Structure 1
Amino acid sequence: ERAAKCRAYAKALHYKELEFQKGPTPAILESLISINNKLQQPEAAAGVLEYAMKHFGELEIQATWYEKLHEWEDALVAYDKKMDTNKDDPELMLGRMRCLEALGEWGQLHQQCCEKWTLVNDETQAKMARMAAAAAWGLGQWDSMEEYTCMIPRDTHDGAFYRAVLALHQDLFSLAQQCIDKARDLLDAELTAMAGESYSRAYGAMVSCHMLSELEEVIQYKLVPERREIIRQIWWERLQGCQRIVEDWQKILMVRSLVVSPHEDMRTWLKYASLCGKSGRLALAHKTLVLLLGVDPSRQLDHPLPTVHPQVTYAYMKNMWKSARKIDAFQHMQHFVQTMQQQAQHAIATEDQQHKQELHKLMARCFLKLGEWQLNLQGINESTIPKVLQYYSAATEHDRSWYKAWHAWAVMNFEAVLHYKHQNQARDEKKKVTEDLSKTLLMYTVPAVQGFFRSISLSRGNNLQDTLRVLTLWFDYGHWPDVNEALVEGVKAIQIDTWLQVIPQLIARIDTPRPLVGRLIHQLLTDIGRYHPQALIYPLTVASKSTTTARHNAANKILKNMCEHSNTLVQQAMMVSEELIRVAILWHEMWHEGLEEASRLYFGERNVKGMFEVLEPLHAMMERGPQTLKETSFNQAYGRDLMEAQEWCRKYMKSGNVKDLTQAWDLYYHVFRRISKQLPQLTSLELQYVSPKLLMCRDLELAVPGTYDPNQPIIRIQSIAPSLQVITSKQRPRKLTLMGSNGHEFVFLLKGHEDLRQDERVMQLFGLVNTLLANDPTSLRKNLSIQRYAVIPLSTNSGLIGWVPHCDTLHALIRDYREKKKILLNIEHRIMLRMAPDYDHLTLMQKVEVFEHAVNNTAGDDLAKLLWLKSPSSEVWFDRRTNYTRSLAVMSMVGYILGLGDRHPSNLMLDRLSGKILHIDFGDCFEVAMTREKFPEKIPFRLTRMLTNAMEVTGLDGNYRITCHTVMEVLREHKDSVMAVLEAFVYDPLLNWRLMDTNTALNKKAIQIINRVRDKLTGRDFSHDDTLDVPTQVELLIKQATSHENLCQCYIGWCPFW
């Protein structure tokens, strides 16, 4: 074999695609949607039709396209247009009907069947029957069913089926019994006849095998009275469980309808109606509810709604709101609630406790909607603010638990706070002012804090947003007593767990000047130290070595406080981090950069005051004396020269000579030449010369950097490998490798001179997006995730980065293929220069040509082609691709929201086993990359030609784009959680330094950026005034990412041709 059959299809698809490559024919296009269908890859094939459309409008009739695109609702009104203009046309009617039997439009499918019965066509007579029997089935009329069934042959699985139904109605159970097994074996043989190249008919066979086993329980229900609960449970469980598109579930219910009328099922049909409105078949969901109410499509439209069945009325109400009629929907809600609280308070004769309870819970949901809709209809202002708070609190009262109700109320209070703040900054743009405002803000701030707390405890494991929110109020409100009280109250109440999510945000405010704020932070941090230290040491250690006093001071206090309690763990972690920092930039390496900088300032800038600031701490750094053999063997070869080179420098400091100063540089240029020679020889570092203390380490209690989480047994640094590979780069990073106490190895990257903190926050954001993605059903269905990695900063300069296994940079894979296939690595580059020696100065017009010309004389395969030559089979090939496409698209949208720039071929990589893509280096975040001076990025994410190519042919139409909406849809819904996180590091006190680089207060700048993000999450990113829906915005983005005009401008290093 079964796994051996798909292998064949995968391999044929490879060649079938490679054929399409050579020339797009409707012939191939056919044997391609089909072969992708066998491979049960639905959406990918859907893309094959998207291309079929936009290039051949040639299986013709825009209704045959709307029909093949399962857009029945479109194909119906397209066929009416196609029929009312045309004539009768036997087939046009067949399709016109097929739309109806999919839409569950039995009313029209039956009429259209009878009302048109000349049907001189005999095939038109044969097909006709199958449809108008099911139509009849849904309409009650069994006589019509039998008439139309007596036309269906007993040869057809369909013909054998409807007999099992007519028998079950007229109570002929052994007739039905046999009919079922005959319809089975007539469908068993039918799944071999179309041995793969069929419709969702092997997927809808599961709809027919479902219905047949259910139709057998419908048999069981008729005589045996003792399965009336058993059968109803499995029916109910295999519903919330099952996920079969609207249409199939109609039929599935129609089987269960022979036995249970909707009024006894209620919950069953509401659940179904619930899904019709979620998938977006409102006019269908309405008809479900109209039935259940047993009252009008409220044709008496000016009349009050029937409170007969409270649960159904509520459904109707929200269907009405999701429908057009939404001031009308709002109105029915106020009155429904008023009717409900009377139906409670008066009608509850005590021995009615369960009805009282479920009744109060429905009301909370009503109040939440009333608040919801009020804000939608009126926005946020001085009239609505109290009204919705009123509605939300009412909900808070009627459910007491329920995350959502306390959430809503918190956010409203918090948005009430924002409303007045942002109104008062409006005032101050043009003494009793501040007072009433202080009364205002304080009035809304305290409830907000309170609400966010009670909401956080009800989320537990899913509260990043609300938790961060607490912090904004906490940090942001230089603490007026009342607010602080609520905070200390919550901190008492809420679990310590919570705060781990948020550790870096807290630590970013250790040195808080606001005295009441800091107090609590320290106490909280210490308590977080008490249960789960580890979760604290690394980050606290970073802090305790900080230029800013108050930081490192207050950081130590918390460490001291942890020694009463975990001392050696504090001590181990203390030292390990110290040592790692020594190992990261070695004594001479620091000198080499310090000498380059010193000569730039003197010989090229006449700056000896900057120069002295560059050299003096390098001299003071060694003044402590060697501490490792590497620090001594350095001290021999260079130290004496340097100590005496400083001698001349300080002879000048006092003499103000220039012959004193030139003697110093005479020595400095000696050691520089010496080191520089030895530098490309640093290809390895041995622990016994470089840091002996780290070699010494055996079986520590310190956890392997960034492996710690509760739930999971703690892994400790059992040993460190004695040799570190030095990746010979500009920042010569180390490839440190550790041994785990579980047994397994852990590899890291010890980076020298990059503040690793930003990357860390991004990984944090990713963590979230990953939860959100695992929780949206569609995304979880497709496995949508960002591959992330560990980031453990060690200071402002250094840190550790988790090594991802099986990875090579995009650049790496190409460089290989290119040299293997004897292609000059930088050929597009050399082509471009040969054409235009002045490329970077050309006009856009001129540039585009050169670029196009380079592309037209080079292969677009490479990536696609090396990924085929990599694969051990063809299904392995195929899946790695499905992974790839998806993973890339995920990060394409997320990267857009993050504004992730600088996506050159050594900043993204590919896992060679999964085929999934992975991003590194999150320096240029937010529009930064595009805002820059020299060589600005015009791109939203890299969607370059070889990446496009490596996808399926029909790429962007297929999997990519679909995955794009799905992901972007999730992001728009969860826009707030996402914005909490981003906001949380735009205004991060120690990270604001990334936007002041627009030079080569911030209050106003940070505001822009965060608006920029909100725009992107509310379809306002493009034109200021349109609110673009996901598929448009996505379309717009792919457009932007692919424009030759945008790509030809990219700095050549970014390789717009890869």
Structure 2
Amino acid sequence: ERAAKCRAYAKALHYKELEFQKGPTPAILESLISINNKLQQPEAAAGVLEYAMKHFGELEIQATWYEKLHEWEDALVAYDKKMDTNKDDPELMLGRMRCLEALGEWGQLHQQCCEKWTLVNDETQAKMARMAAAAAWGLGQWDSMEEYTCMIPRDTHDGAFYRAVLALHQDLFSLAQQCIDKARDLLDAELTAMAGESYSRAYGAMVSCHMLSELEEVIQYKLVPERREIIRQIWWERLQGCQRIVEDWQKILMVRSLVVSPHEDMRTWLKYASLCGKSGRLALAHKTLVLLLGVDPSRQLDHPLPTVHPQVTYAYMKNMWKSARKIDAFQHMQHFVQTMQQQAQHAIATEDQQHKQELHKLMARCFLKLGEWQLNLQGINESTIPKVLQYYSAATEHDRSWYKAWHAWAVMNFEAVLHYKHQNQARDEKKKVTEDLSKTLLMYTVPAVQGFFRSISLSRGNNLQDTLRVLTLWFDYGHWPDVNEALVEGVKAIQIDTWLQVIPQLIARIDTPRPLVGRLIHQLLTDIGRYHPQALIYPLTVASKSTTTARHNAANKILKNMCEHSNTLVQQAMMVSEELIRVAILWHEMWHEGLEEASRLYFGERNVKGMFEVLEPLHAMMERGPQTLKETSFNQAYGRDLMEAQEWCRKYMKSGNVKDLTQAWDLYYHVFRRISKQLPQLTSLELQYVSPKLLMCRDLELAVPGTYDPNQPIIRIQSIAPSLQVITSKQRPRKLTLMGSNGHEFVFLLKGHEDLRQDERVMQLFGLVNTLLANDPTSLRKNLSIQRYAVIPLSTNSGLIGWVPHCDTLHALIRDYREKKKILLNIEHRIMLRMAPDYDHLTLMQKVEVFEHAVNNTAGDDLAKLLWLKSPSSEVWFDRRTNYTRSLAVMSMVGYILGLGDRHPSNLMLDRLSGKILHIDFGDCFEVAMTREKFPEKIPFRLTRMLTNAMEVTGLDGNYRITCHTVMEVLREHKDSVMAVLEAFVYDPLLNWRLMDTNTALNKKAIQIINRVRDKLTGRDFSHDDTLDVPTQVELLIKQATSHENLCQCYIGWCPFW
């Protein structure tokens, strides 16, 4: 019954939205926030009001807009401005007051009511009473309250509520008990009207129902002497648990204030004041603490703070810091700690060993703040470094088992190392210089290593950053005896689990030329071999076949060692990966690319020595002979010609005649044409012809690729499906499908000539970003996540990609719609070329015209429209859309930080059941797409028109922008984690190749990229000199993503008009 209730709204909204499409009136705009509210979708409705502001300043007192936005502090100082210019206006006065009640400014709300009482007409007076009652309640003026409560009718739920509160002050129980049950039904029947306040009083009825159950808990407290601890516990649990905003919680505590004073209840009121501080209502947070101190608004401003309650003072200090007065805050802290250690050492009689411990914990927190603040005021330099480290190590002592404490100490040492390094690079731009530096770096390196180790063991599960840092120090400096010792020590101490997280980063250094670092890497990998070998066999197998010799040597040494306990798993992994590389690119496809290349080098470039280097591995490949039926059937129809083509090539080698070499090419092009004709005649592959060894595979102990994790039972490769569908790209991926030992099937894209190492580390980054979103409460509340897939490299060319189910590319969905609707698929393109045959060569101005022409003669609604017709009902349509908007904004922001280029309509897809978005292909990363020569990107992410359309109407103001902020806020907070991960691949020795392609040392280049990322994560990504806060930077980006001047410049294939 309630299930079918939202369906009606969801369907009504769809048409109501399409009505806004027809003509945006205030008539639709009003009847759209309302339906969005009943649909319990608050942030999407918030966007409707944003549009209402930005187009219709027509229900505008600027203070009514600030009121509707719940921006009470702006609305108050706007209602001041409007009032002192005009007269007394009984409308503005109530407006002015509503701000003061939602600010919880009872001091003035009671004042301003009594300051104007002849000017209260019987309309104005009726509203007046309700607010001046809570104002009196907030000031414990029960005389004033009762006089105002005698003014509010018993018919209003509000009236009946304030009677319940007044009887409870006066200890009348059965009176108040009735008043509650009557205030319920006068609100039960109230919300049936639904027209007064449809959500801010429906969520605010949950305020009242909470308050009315809490008032029934208060009636229990003042009447049952044994439910003291029990009620207080449910009061405390549903406080760390319960999330209700500042304003609501003023009221919630006011109920409890009847029964418990703040002094008996410090942990509650501090947590409350913590939240007022966290949300940014500082002057309110202050007033709470002031009350708890039993002294001090900052009034005796020159005096010491009172130690009286050490816990309260500490909060006050960080409030003061969070205010403006932060030199002051730093000073009061330095002194507070000095007091605390003396109140420990000397005042400890041995009986107080709980009080010693909690006090020692407080100090650790103070010591951390001191270090944090010192850096904020002074930065990192010669004078601050030893002082902060002192504060940090102090914190280390007082709470030996605190992650934060150990982390901060580690980081400070690490940044001390960096400070001196970066100082020395600065020195060299302009003997004893190195020797002092050696001792300086070592001084801070060993501690940093130790710190990061103790912090790693204090995390466990969440420590990617700390782990990666340990590797930075290891790979950078771990060949100095002292540093090495610390590492060996640490490696022993830390659980082995840790390193799995970091396996690709380690393997990347298998071949380290430094001997001391090499040893420990091999040592470690061997031990990660012993326990959970699954996590190593695929990557080690990749490494063991490597043109770079020292890589493959050292890989095999580990696999040798792994055989002595896991032999037939190693053997299986060896074989399965061999056969997959064979299947990835068949013998003829290898010959195809190798003859494009050799014809470019010889004919198109005049290079026989290059040409010879291309063909020689291919001829030598076949010199081993056919191994599969498909290898023979090739070798049959072509082999004869090729062996003889090589013959003529080697006749030239000793003669030099072009006529010896043209007879070779005459043979080469025979097979080349022949291959090309047969190429789109591979739409399927059969495992019995292509790799028999794989068909044969039954019940292996090798895990299904990238399914191993230690928490969960091993899914092994039970059997491989005998047929591989070949997707017809220019790369031609095979659709490989394995049966798991668990029952379920597992589908992969087996890819030839596609370096998947990049996508691998990118998938890693999403992992972390996923963690941080699961961890930030708001982000969890909204289910913000990245859809990721398995990435299993197999060599430089090849590798497997997890096939995500139920997804179709943007392109596919549009193709299908346009054909179904008999629209020519490529209509904008054809429109554009008809108008301007030279489109790509036009001035920006000229381009914009043609772009605009195309857009204005085509429907932008395709994606929106298809997503509607797809859905089996309207409430499923709605959720899918909520999901869509959210998931797209997640990847907008993350994508932007990563610098993820090339987001054309085949490179993002949509899961047709949830509506969530998926990015594939992480080739173009960092600014790469934008820095290129021909068709550079101007876009920070695709916020293309059909995407926008497919949102709600008011989309960009709604969920999209709000989600954008949230994601970005998470990113900026956790910048260090994100930077650790990126730095890991930017400085990865094997992956530096992506940024020398700006041509069509790298040390220098790498630095740039990372700066660019740091910039983005601090809002210094537009102006060097301004530091933009989140909502500003997001707004700049949406602006940028959306600029026609930008979009018209995109390579046509990217489809700027989609």
TM-score normalised by the chain length of structure 1: 1.00
Listed one character per residue, the Cα deviations across residues 470-506 of structure 1 (whole Å, up to 9, x for unaligned) are 0000000151100001101111110100001100000
Listed one character per residue, the Cα deviations across residues 309-353 of structure 1 (whole Å, up to 9, x for unaligned) are 000000000000000100000000000000111110111111111
By how many angstroms is 1:660 displaced? Answer: 1.6
Q: Report the CA distance shift for 1:446/1:826 in structure 2 as closer, same or farther (over 3 A).
A: same
Partner of 2:294: 294
For residues 1056 and 148 of structure 1, the distance between their equivalents in structure 2, rounded to whole angstroms, comes to: 63
Listed one character per residue, the Cα deviations across residues 681-738 of structure 1 (whole Å, up to 9, x for unaligned) are 1000000000000000000000000000011111000000000000111011100000
Listed one character per residue, the Cα deviations across residues 79-136 of structure 1 (whole Å, up to 9, x for unaligned) are 0111111111111111111111110000011011111111342111111111111110
For residues 580 and 189 of structure 1, the distance between their equivalents in structure 2, rounded to whole angstroms, comes to: 69
CA contact (8 A) 1:719 1:740 kept: yes
By how many angstroms is 1:600 displaced? Answer: 1.9
For residues 436 and 659 of structure 2, the distance between their equivalents in structure 1, rounded to whole angstroms, comes to: 70
Partner of 1:985: 985
By how many angstroms is 1:649 displaced? Answer: 1.2
For residues 944 and 291 of structure 2, the distance between their equivalents in structure 1, rounded to whole angstroms, comes to: 54
Partner of 2:336: 336
By how many angstroms is 1:440 displaced? Answer: 0.1
Map 1:923-1002 onto structure 2 (within 5 A): 923-1002=923-1002
By how many angstroms is 1:195 displaced? Answer: 7.1
For residues 523 and 898 of structure 1, the distance between their equivalents in structure 2, rounded to whole angstroms, comes to: 33
For residues 28 and 508 of structure 1, the distance between their equivalents in structure 2, rounded to whole angstroms, comes to: 59
3-state SS of paired residue (1:805): coil
For residues 909 and 628 of structure 1, the distance between their equivalents in structure 2, rounded to whole angstroms, comes to: 37
For residues 195 and 825 of structure 2, the distance between their equivalents in structure 1, rounded to whole angstroms, comes to: 47
For residues 296 and 658 of structure 1, the distance between their equivalents in structure 2, rounded to whole angstroms, comes to: 98
TM-score normalised by the chain length of structure 2: 1.00
For residues 600 and 930 of structure 1, the distance between their equivalents in structure 2, rounded to whole angstroms, comes to: 28
For residues 685 and 172 of structure 1, the distance between their equivalents in structure 2, rounded to whole angstroms, comes to: 85
Listed one character per residue, the Cα deviations across residues 490-531 of structure 1 (whole Å, up to 9, x for unaligned) are 111101000011000000000000000010000100111111
By how many angstroms is 1:604 displaced? Answer: 2.1
3-state SS of paired residue (2:801): strand
3-state SS of paired residue (2:934): coil
CA contact (8 A) 1:133 1:149 kept: yes
Moved more, 974-983 or 340-349: 340-349
3-state SS of paired residue (1:263): coil
Listed one character per residue, the Cα deviations across residues 196-232 of structure 1 (whole Å, up to 9, x for unaligned) are 9713211111111101111011001112111111111
Listed one character per residue, the Cα deviations across residues 37-78 of structure 1 (whole Å, up to 9, x for unaligned) are 010111111000111111111101100000000000110111
3-state SS of paired residue (1:239): helix
CA contact (8 A) 1:885 1:951 kept: yes
By how many angstroms is 1:602 displaced? Answer: 2.1
For residues 1009 and 488 of structure 2, the distance between their equivalents in structure 1, rounded to whole angstroms, comes to: 33
CA contact (8 A) 1:317 1:329 kept: yes
For residues 160 and 876 of structure 1, the distance between their equivalents in structure 2, rounded to whole angstroms, comes to: 41
By how many angstroms is 1:605 displaced? Answer: 2.1
Listed one character per residue, the Cα deviations across residues 330-378 of structure 1 (whole Å, up to 9, x for unaligned) are 0000000001111101111111111111001000000000000000000
Partner of 1:268: 268
Identify unmatched segments of 5+ residues in structure 1: none
CA contact (8 A) 2:340 2:363 kept: yes
3-state SS of paired residue (2:226): helix
CA contact (8 A) 2:510 2:518 kept: yes
For residues 378 and 241 of structure 1, the distance between their equivalents in structure 2, rounded to whole angstroms, comes to: 38
By how many angstroms is 1:393 displaced? Answer: 0.4
CA contact (8 A) 2:90 2:120 kept: no
For residues 819 and 2 of structure 2, the distance between their equivalents in structure 1, rounded to whole angstroms, comes to: 40
CA contact (8 A) 1:38 1:196 kept: no
Listed one character per residue, the Cα deviations across residues 835-866 of structure 1 (whole Å, up to 9, x for unaligned) are 11111111111111111111111110000110
3-state SS of paired residue (1:226): coil
Listed one character per residue, the Cα deviations across residues 858-900 of structure 1 (whole Å, up to 9, x for unaligned) are 1100001100011111111011000000000000000000000
Pairing 1:873–2:873 present: yes
Partner of 2:580: 580
For residues 106 and 21 of structure 2, the distance between their equivalents in structure 1, rounded to whole angstroms, comes to: 45
CA contact (8 A) 1:34 1:198 kept: yes
3-state SS of paired residue (2:264): helix
Listed one character per residue, the Cα deviations across residues 400-440 of structure 1 (whole Å, up to 9, x for unaligned) are 01100000000000000000000001111110000000000
Map 1:441-590 onto structure 2 (within 5 A): 441-590=441-590
CA contact (8 A) 1:684 1:726 kept: yes
CA contact (8 A) 1:893 1:967 kept: yes
Listed one character per residue, the Cα deviations across residues 925-979 of structure 1 (whole Å, up to 9, x for unaligned) are 0001001101100110010000011000111111100000100000000000000
By how many angstroms is 1:611 displaced? Answer: 1.4
Listed one character per residue, the Cα deviations across residues 633-689 of structure 1 (whole Å, up to 9, x for unaligned) are 111101001111111111111111122212111211111121111111100000000
3-state SS of paired residue (1:145): helix
By how many angstroms is 1:918 displaced? Answer: 0.7
For residues 578 and 118 of structure 1, the distance between their equivalents in structure 2, rounded to whole angstroms, comes to: 93
For residues 810 and 945 of structure 1, the distance between their equivalents in structure 2, rounded to whole angstroms, comes to: 13
By how many angstroms is 1:606 displaced? Answer: 2.1
CA contact (8 A) 1:37 1:197 kept: no
Q: Report the CA distance shift for 1:487/1:398 in structure 2 as closer, same or farther (over 3 A).
A: same
For residues 531 and 196 of structure 1, the distance between their equivalents in structure 2, rounded to whole angstroms, comes to: 65
For residues 662 and 327 of structure 2, the distance between their equivalents in structure 1, rounded to whole angstroms, comes to: 84
CA contact (8 A) 2:735 2:747 kept: yes
Moved more, 611-620 or 701-710: 611-620
Partner of 1:616: 616
Partner of 1:70: 70
For residues 917 and 408 of structure 1, the distance between their equivalents in structure 2, rounded to whole angstroms, comes to: 37
Listed one character per residue, the Cα deviations across residues 732-753 of structure 1 (whole Å, up to 9, x for unaligned) are 1100000000000000000000
CA contact (8 A) 2:389 2:412 kept: yes
By how many angstroms is 1:33 displaced? Answer: 0.7
CA contact (8 A) 1:747 1:803 kept: yes
RMSD: 0.8
CA contact (8 A) 1:500 1:535 kept: yes
Identify unmatched segments of 5+ residues in structure 2: none
For residues 798 and 621 of structure 2, the distance between their equivalents in structure 1, rounded to whole angstroms, comes to: 17
For residues 686 and 1031 of structure 2, the distance between their equivalents in structure 1, rounded to whole angstroms, comes to: 55
For residues 658 and 480 of structure 1, the distance between their equivalents in structure 2, rounded to whole angstroms, comes to: 58
For residues 197 and 270 of structure 1, the distance between their equivalents in structure 2, rounded to whole angstroms, comes to: 32
Q: Report the CA distance shift for 1:54/1:708 in structure 2 as closer, same or farther (over 3 A).
A: same
Partner of 1:696: 696
Q: Report the CA distance shift for 1:498/1:478 in structure 2 as closer, same or farther (over 3 A).
A: closer
CA contact (8 A) 2:478 2:484 kept: no
CA contact (8 A) 2:864 2:946 kept: yes
CA contact (8 A) 1:38 1:197 kept: no
CA contact (8 A) 2:396 2:406 kept: yes
Partner of 2:212: 212
By how many angstroms is 1:603 displaced? Answer: 2.2
Moved more, 802-811 or 655-664: 655-664
3-state SS of paired residue (2:925): coil
3-state SS of paired residue (1:535): helix
For residues 371 and 1052 of structure 1, the distance between their equivalents in structure 2, rounded to whole angstroms, comes to: 53
3-state SS of paired residue (2:222): helix
Moved more, 909-918 or 189-198: 189-198
For residues 491 and 997 of structure 1, the distance between their equivalents in structure 2, rounded to whole angstroms, comes to: 38
3-state SS of paired residue (1:359): helix
Listed one character per residue, the Cα deviations across residues 788-820 of structure 1 (whole Å, up to 9, x for unaligned) are 000000000000000000000000000000111
For residues 117 and 478 of structure 1, the distance between their equivalents in structure 2, rounded to whole angstroms, comes to: 79
CA contact (8 A) 1:10 1:878 kept: yes
3-state SS of paired residue (2:534): coil
Partner of 2:225: 225
Moved more, 189-198 or 205-214: 189-198
CA contact (8 A) 1:686 1:723 kept: yes
Moved more, 195-204 or 462-471: 195-204
3-state SS of paired residue (1:800): strand
By how many angstroms is 1:165 displaced? Answer: 0.8
For residues 463 and 900 of structure 1, the distance between their equivalents in structure 2, rounded to whole angstroms, comes to: 25
